[PDB]
Structures are given as C-alpha cells and as structure tokens.
Design a protein around this nucleic acid. Structure first.
Ligand SMILES: [K+]
Ligand SMILES: [Mg+2]
Ligand SMILES: [Mg+2]
Ligand SMILES: [Mg+2]
Ligand SMILES: [Mg+2]
Ligand SMILES: [Mg+2]
Ligand code: NA
Ligand code: NA
Ligand code: NA
Lengths: 47, 50, 141, 113, 128, 154, 105, 77
RNA sequence: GACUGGGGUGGUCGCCUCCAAAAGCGUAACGGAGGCUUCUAAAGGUACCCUCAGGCCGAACCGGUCAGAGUGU
RNA sequence: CAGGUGGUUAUAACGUUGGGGAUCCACCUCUUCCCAUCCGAACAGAGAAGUUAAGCCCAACGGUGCCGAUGGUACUGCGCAGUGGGAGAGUAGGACGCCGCCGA
C-alpha cells in the first residue's frame, strides 16, 4: 500500500518524488515546496 | 477556571430538613431554592404465665 | 542426577581449565572434606555414586555437602556419524573442576569415620584426591 | 518533584544550547518572589562582567514595571562596560511576564540581540 | 591467651622475593593498624602455632628485629589452594582504645573471654 | 463564606488538640484536595454518562481517565480551595443505609472513603471511591484526626 | 423519603404505603386512618403536614425497614443456634410447619 | 542431519580512527560507533550514524566527566 | 548449478545482529543463536512542556519509598 | 545570617540530630488583566496579611552510598617462571567537599 508519489504544478516543470501509504492517506497529498524555476515556494500536488 | 466547560447555574441553594428544623445554605448546583429532605425467653415466660 | 531445571542455551563450547581453584578451596560448612588434585569433568552419575557411598557409611549420623554442580551440557556424535554437520546428541551435564576444589564435605562424625567415609567416596571419583580437615579442629572431643 | 529540580532540568536544557564568551556574554536572570536580578557572565572565565537588580531600585509597585526598570539599568551597565551583543538565558523560566519585560527593555536599551 | 613471636625484617618485595623466602620454610607477614606505618617481616612455620590450634589465642606479642614490640591479633591468613600451606599472614595491631571485633570459640553458652588487650565486641565462632 | 472561615477562626488543633505547637500555624494540618474517581470497564456510553454524573455531583467538569491499554476506563474530578475548606458541606447532610464509616488511615493521612451506592447523592450500579489528600510532618493519625465526618468506633 | 424509602409517587396512599418493609394492606389502612389522611390520595398530593403525620404514626410503633430486618435476622439466628427441630429444619432447608415432603418442595 | 546456523553479516570496521594527541584536519572522521560511546565536545560534530568528526583543525582530546562519560574534543591553535 | 570430512539424500546460496574473535581493525568451519526482502503524512521539522516500569499502604484514584520501561520491527 | 552563577568524574551524594529570620530566599494571600490546567496543584500575574513549620543555609554524627592503600596472590611478555609487567576481591584507613566571579 506504499507507493511512489509525484508532486507537480511547477512552471519546464518542478517535480518532487516522495512516498506515501495510499490506504492511510487516500486523499491527494499537497505540500508547499521550493520551485527552482520561479525561485520561490509554490504548492505542489500529487498527480 | 476554564469558562464554559464548568457547569453553569451554580446558584446558592438551601437544604431544609422537614423533620429536624435544620436549614443550611450552600452553592449546590441544583433567594435560595429550597430542597426538602426527610433527615428474653425467661421474661416472655414470666409475662405470659408468671 | 543434578542438572539445571532450565537453561538459556542448549549447547556450550568446550572451554579450557587453566590453573588452581581460587574459590571453594577452604572448608566452609563442615569439618572434613576432600579436594581434587586434578582437572576434570565430573559427571552426575559419579557424583551420585560417591554421595551414596559416603551416606551409606557414617550410618544415619552427620551431614554431607556436595559443593560442585554439573551445569555444562555435553554432546556425543554417535556410531557411524562422520565429522561435521553440527553438534551431536546431548548426553547430560558435567561440572569442570581444577586442583584445589573441594568436592565433598562432612560434619558431625569422628575423625576416623569421616576419613573412612571420604576414602570410600573418593574411590568412585575420576580424580586423585586429598583429604583435609579444618585447621582449628580439636583432635579430641 | 520540587520546583527547584523542575527548574534545574530546564536550566540544563537551556545551557545545552546557550553559552557565553567575552564577546556575546550570557545574560542570566533570577526572579524570586520579589525583586529581580540580572547578570552578565563570561562563561569561559567564570567571571561576571556586569550586573543589575531592583534591590536598591524602586519606582512603582508592580513587578512588570520594576523589571522594565531593571532591564533599562542592565542595558546601561552593559553599554558602559562595552557590551553590545549578548545571548539571553531563560534560566529555567518561561519567556513570558516579568522576564519578558526585562528582555524587552534591554532591547529598547542597547544590547542588540 | 598470650602468644610470643619474633620476626626477621623484610625489605624485598615481589613474587621473586616471596618465593625465595618461602623456599627456606618461612612466611611473609605484615602488621598494620592504628597509628604508624605498617611493618613487613618474616616468621617461621614452626614459630606459628596459633594457626593450627583450637582456641582464639589473642595477644600475639611480636618482637620485630628491625622494629619495636607490639601486641596484635590474627587478621588474615592466606593458604595455598592445593598444598594447604601457609603463604602469608597479616596482623592487626590492637591498642588501648578502638575496640577490635574478633571470633571467640563457644563452649556448649560460654566463650574464652576478651576484656584486656582487645576492648569488646566479640562476634561468635562456630555458632552451629 | 465556606467552612474555611470557621476553620481559620478556630484553628484549635495547634493548642486544643495540641501537637505541632511550634508557634507556627504552618504546622497545622490542612486538607489539600478532594478527589472523586469512579472507574468502570464497560467501555461506550458508560463513560459519557458517568462524566455527566460526576460533573453534576461536583459542580465542575470531570475529564475521563485513560487506562494505561488505550480506552476511557474511568472518570475523575479533583476539587480544591472551594470544596468546603462546598463539597464537604454538601456531603455532611447525607445518609446511606446505616452509620459506621470506617477509620482506616493511609500512613500519612488520607480518608479514602469507598461508597458503593451512588443514590446517596441528593442531586443524583455505580461507585464513589472518594479520597481526601491532606498535608497532615505528616502524622499518621495524630494530625489525621482532624476529621469532622462520621467515623465508626467514635 | 418517608423512612428512607422512596415510594411510587403516582399511587394511592393505602397501596403505596405497602412498599415499605413491615407494612401491608391492613397496616397501611390502619396507619392512614390513625394519621387522619384519606386513603385515596396520591403520594404526590400529600401535604407537608400530612406527610409529617404519617411519618410520626410510622414512628412510635410499627417496627419497619432496617429494624425489622435486623429483628428477623436475629430471631432466625437464635432459632438456628438453639439447635431445636425447627432450627435444624431451617439449617437443612426443609419445610418445618408440618408439611410433608417426598411430593412437593 | 543438518545445522540451522551458518549466517553472519559483514563487519562494519567500527572504532576509534584518530586517537588522543593526534592532529586532525577539518572533516576528518574521529570515531565510528553505534550510539554515543563517545560524545561530541568542543569543535566536534556528530553525524546521522553517530560518527564523530572534526569541525576545525587541531589536536584530538579525550576527556572523562561525571558518570565516567567520555567526550571527544578538538583543541585548536 | 555449486558447496559438501567421497558422491547421493537432506540442508544451504544475497543482506542485518550477537558469540566463535585471542582488550585497535580484520579473521574460517554442513561451528552456536536469531532476524530481513519493510514501515511512518507523522513515527518528519521546530518552539514549549512532561517522565516510565516495579514493591508497599488505603479504597482506574491517593501516598511515599524508587532503570527495570519505552525507543514500529 | 542564608541569594545568583561556574569549575573540578559523589573524598563532593544521601541521611539522622540540633539552630535560624531587621532583609535575602522561601512557604504563604487573591485570580481583574497577561497566561494555564477537570483542578491558580504546576505555569502566570497582582504586594505585604503571618510564619522558620517545610524548602534553604549552618553545626555535629562514620550511619547508607563513594573512595581506598601496603603486603600477598591470580594472570602475563621474553619462541621459561631464569629475567621483566602485575590485577580483582578483601583488609588497614579516608571522607559530612575543594577552588572562583557578582550582590547584600
Ligand atoms: K598489589
Ligand atoms: Mg557483526
Ligand atoms: Mg559437486
Ligand atoms: Mg577485535
Ligand atoms: Mg587482539
Ligand atoms: Mg586493589
Ligand atoms: Na562463518
Ligand atoms: Na570497591
Ligand atoms: Na579492594
């Protein structure tokens, strides 16, 4: 139930690869991460 | 101390004994409201016959 | 047969006996005793035979202490079994002793009875033995 | 669990991160049931550089203003001794109340920290 | 209740010196207790008869050749593990004050009596 | 006010009861706090009802108690500085079956009074198991005799 | 409430008084008549004076509740410990008023 | 018959790498350990696997404090 | 397929921990014991604040004497 | 007369007995505001009603802990116990801390 998770919504694009337990967290994981293209912190969401 | 969590209507009430003429005043959470509260064998042989 | 009621490990490495016994070499609990003069593994059968001898002597009088306890498990391979493939079958427990260690103690009997009974016990043991008495003992009464 | 040991554990925790040198001395504070004491300490030498207290200082009746006066006094004493940078030591007290006023007043004075 | 003993002074220490002493049938002994530093000396196996003995013979008067004379009691004895021979003796010097605790033989409810030399506080011996 | 006024006025333990007479009222035994804890293993509405019962009895909210293996297996409430020192005053006019309240101490002074029925409450299967922590220098009984409640064997 | 007993608040006096240990129908009627309270009045409708009269009639006579329970227990204990025929019958659990067993409990 | 044993993991080469009195450059590893057998002191940092390393250049010093606690520090200049 | 106190049969094959290991590191056996092929969106970061387990007394609560507990595995 | 803050690995700790108090520390008094917990118990604030009772400090005590010789023994290096190294435990004893800075 643990799987790869991709965070997206950069600006190319900004991606972060993490892990999560989908049964424990069914809902989409969204976190604020640094965006290298815009040089600021933006909200990334799981695709 | 924590306002709201503690029970409200903590009025002063009087406990009155109806059969002891005793009146007390406290702050029981229940111009004081009044609560009424209520609060051998040889001898037998000699008595029968003697 | 003396052996521990429970044990943490079933098998034990065959260690090495090195010098003289620095503990249990003095007569405490009794008046007469026998000390080993060799280094050996004493088995429960030998201990029980010696105790039976020393108790059949002395009649019912006196008290006998055995001061060693077998708590070292040993194994034997078995006939037709080659070397290797792990430890063999368990074959009881032994007590390792070094010279100076007192094995048997007696109290409450005269000098001659004690000497004879401990001689009888020592004749059933696999080690040469020395008979000893407490140094503050009075020869008479 | 005595309040003394309760504060001693917190004192050890705070000293686990805060230590004072000749530059950036430790500003330690003692509260007590009345008055308030402030000390400037160089820990590598075990030597106090400056001090201030409210024992001979009295202007109001409320400990918050008295603590503010002590903070102003210790800022003055430190700037006279040649101290501009410090590190504050809670000394086992929660940073709120009289000690907060003392530290705020020391900020209004010199002692850029 | 008074043994007499004399001691040859001892100034060599170590396993070699002790072996040399014991080869000629003698025992290294030390004496300590109270004020003053300890005294090292040599006694003889024949000279010690308070060891292989029934009673607690207090008041060993020791005359050490290099030293004065003292009144002590037996404090510690070391035996060989195999031969049961005496290899070292340590004496505790008893004074007027500072009572010393020792073991006194018991007869049936009796004792041997410790009032002089040693002060008091005798524990027991063979309490069976 | 409460019984605190009368207690401070009398203060007869230092002299009339004697003992701890060091000219210090700070040596006089006082009642620190009264704790009422029911406790029950039925959980789950039992705890949510017992909390209400304790709150009604005490006048203050009773938080549930953890059981540490992770459940609300008890309800308790601690009262201080206002428990008639009106809790003691409210408890004084009460009766249940008969008289003969026990006189068991705790080694430092604690009237741990265990009551089976909860129907003796004028406001209200249950239990009471009330306790009275007091700073008795804690005499086992000599300063633990400052109890104005009923007691068996006088 | 009355002798330490909470009565059914919605019942007539001559029935609700029987809920006390030691009072039956006859005793309830007699108690109400001696106290001067009409027997067909609900318990909730009793005046304070009428309740006081009933309680005072219950006192001074009519051993009820814990007193009667203790008296009955004491009588049973004395009967058992005297070692009489009825005492051993009560100790062994058999009828003692002349009833014959082997057919009924 | 057969044996149920025969397994063992690789050795991790733990222990002290720079002893007291030696000269250490910045970033040099001083101790490899499981847990804090030796605790970091002045000018000594501790890593994720409790590896002790030098934050400066100087001489390594081992010291013992209360409860016989062992500290590794660097004396610089 | 290989190892293998001949071969076969049986067991084993990568990683982790202890002992064998001889007070730095390293070190073999079909020597002695056990585990793994994951988990946590908080069981991560930080500020602040707390302190288990056991014995006794009273009846989950009170009291004071005391590293055993926990740290997913 | 007591307070604050440090160095020295308890020879420094714990404990028992006894004594403090103009202020210093503390207990203590009350919750309007800051702030906090079911609970002003803790935390936080408000200024002086009373206490040395407790904390705290001082003195005596070798009681529990802690430290610990000399001598001997175990073990051990030299491929012979000839020549070197030398415990642990135990016994004598020690020890009711020793050095700083600030304030009064
Ligand atoms: K030595
Ligand atoms: Mg390993
Ligand atoms: Mg092959
Ligand atoms: Mg190694
Ligand atoms: Mg090696
Ligand atoms: Mg030693
Ligand atoms: Na191997
Ligand atoms: Na020791
Ligand atoms: Na020793």
């Amino acid at each position: 139930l643990e799987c790869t998770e991709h965070k997206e919504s950069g600006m190319g694009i900004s991606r972060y690869i993490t892990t999560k337990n989908r049964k424990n967290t069914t809902q989409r994981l969204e976190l604020k991460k640094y965006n290298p293209i815009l040089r600021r912190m933006t909200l990334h969401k799981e695709i | 101390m924590k306002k709201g969590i503690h029970p409200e209507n903590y009025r002063p009430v009087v406990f009155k004994d109806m059969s002891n003429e005793d009146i007390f005043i406290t702050r029981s959470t229940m111009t004081y409201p009044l609560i009424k509260v209520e609060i051998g064998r040889v001898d037998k042989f000699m008595s029968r016959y003697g | 047969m003396l052996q521990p009621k429970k044990t943490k490990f079933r098998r034990q490495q065959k260690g090495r006996m090195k010098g003289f016994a620095q503990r249990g070499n003095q007569l405490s609990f009794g008046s007469f005793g026998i000390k080993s003069l060799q280094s050996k593994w004493i088995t429960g059968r030998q201990i029980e035979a010696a105790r039976i001898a020393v108790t059949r002597y002395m009649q019912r009088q006196g008290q006998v202490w055995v001061r060693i306890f077998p708590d070292k498990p040993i194994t034997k391979k078995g006939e037709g079994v080659r070397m290797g493939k792990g430890k063999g079958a368990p074959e009881g427990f032994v007590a390792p002793i070094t010279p100076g260690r007192i094995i048997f103690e007696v109290e409450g009997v005269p000098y001659e009875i004690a000497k004879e009974a401990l001689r009888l016990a020592a004749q059933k043991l696999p080690v040469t033995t020395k008979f000893v008495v407490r140094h503050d003992y009075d020869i008479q009464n | 669990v005595t309040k003394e040991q309760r504060r001693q554990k917190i004192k050890a925790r705070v000293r686990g991160k805060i230590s004072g040198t000749q530059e950036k001395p430790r500003l330690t504070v003692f509260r007590s049931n009345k008055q308030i004491y402030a000390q400037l300490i160089d820990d590598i030498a075990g030597r106090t550089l400056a001090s201030a207290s409210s024992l001979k200082l009295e202007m109001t009746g409320s400990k918050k203003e008295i603590a503010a006066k002590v903070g102003d006094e210790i800022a003055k004493a430190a700037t006279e001794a040649g101290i501009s940078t410090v590190v504050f030591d809670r000394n086992g007290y929660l940073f709120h109340g009289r000690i907060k006023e003392l530290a705020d007043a020391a900020r209004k004075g010199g002692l850029k920290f | 209740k008074t043994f007499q003993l004399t001691g040859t002074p001892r100034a060599e220490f170590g396993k070699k010196a002790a072996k040399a002493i014991r080869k000629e049938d003698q025992i290294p002994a030390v004496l300590y207790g109270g004020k003053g530093e300890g005294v090292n000396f040599i006694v003889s196996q024949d000279a010690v008869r308070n060891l292989i003995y029934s009673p607690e013979i207090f008041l060993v008067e020791l005359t050490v050749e290099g030293s004065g004379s003292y009144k002590a009691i037996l404090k510690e004895i070391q035996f060989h593990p195999v031969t049961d021979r005496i290899i070292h003796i340590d004496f505790l010097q008893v004074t007027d004050e500072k009572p010393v605790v020792m073991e006194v033989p018991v007869v049936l409810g009796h004792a041997e009596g410790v009032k002089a030399g040693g002060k008091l506080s005798l524990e027991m011996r063979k309490l069976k | 006010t409460a019984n605190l006024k009368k207690d401070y006025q009398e203060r007869i333990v230092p002299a009339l009861m004697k003992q701890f007479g060091y000219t210090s009222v700070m040596q006089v035994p006082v009642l620190k706090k009264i704790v009422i804890n029911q406790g029950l293993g039925m959980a789950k509405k039992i705890i949510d009802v017992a909390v209400s019962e304790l709150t009604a009895i005490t006048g203050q909210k009773a938080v549930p108690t953890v059981s540490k293996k992770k459940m609300p297996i008890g309800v308790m409430v601690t009262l201080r500085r206002e428990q008639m020192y009106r809790l003691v005053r409210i408890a004084l006019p009460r009766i249940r079956d008969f008289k003969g309240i026990e006189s068991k101490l705790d080694g430092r002074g604690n009237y741990t009074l265990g009551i089976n029925e909860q129907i003796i409450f004028p406001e209200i299967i249950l239990g009471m198991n009330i306790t009275f922590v007091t700073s008795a220098d804690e005499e086992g009984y000599a300063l633990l005799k400052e109890f104005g409640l009923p007691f068996k064997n006088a | 409430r009355i002798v330490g007993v909470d009565l059914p608040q919605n019942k007539r006096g001559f029935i609700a008084l029987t809920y006390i240990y030691g009072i039956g129908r006859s005793s309830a009627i007699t108690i109400l008549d001696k106290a001067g309270v009409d027997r067909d009045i609900k318990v909730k409708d009793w005046s304070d004076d009428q309740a006081a009269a009933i309680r005072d009639v219950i006192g001074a006579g009519y051993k009820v509740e814990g007193d009667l329970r203790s008296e009955v227990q004491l009588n049973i204990k004395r009967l058992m410990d005297i070692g009489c025929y009825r005492g051993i019958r009560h100790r062994i659990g058999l009828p003692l008023r002349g009833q014959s067993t082997k057919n009924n409990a | 018959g057969s044996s149920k044993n025969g397994r063992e993991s690789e050795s991790k080469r733990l222990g002290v790498k720079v002893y007291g009195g030696e000269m250490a450059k910045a970033g040099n590893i001083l101790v490899r350990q499981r847990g804090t057998v030796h605790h970091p002191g002045e000018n000594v940092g501790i890593g994720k696997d409790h590896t002790l390393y030098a934050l400066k250049s100087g001489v390594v010093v081992f010291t013992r404090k209360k409860n016989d606690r062992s500290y590794v520090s660097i004396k610089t200049e």
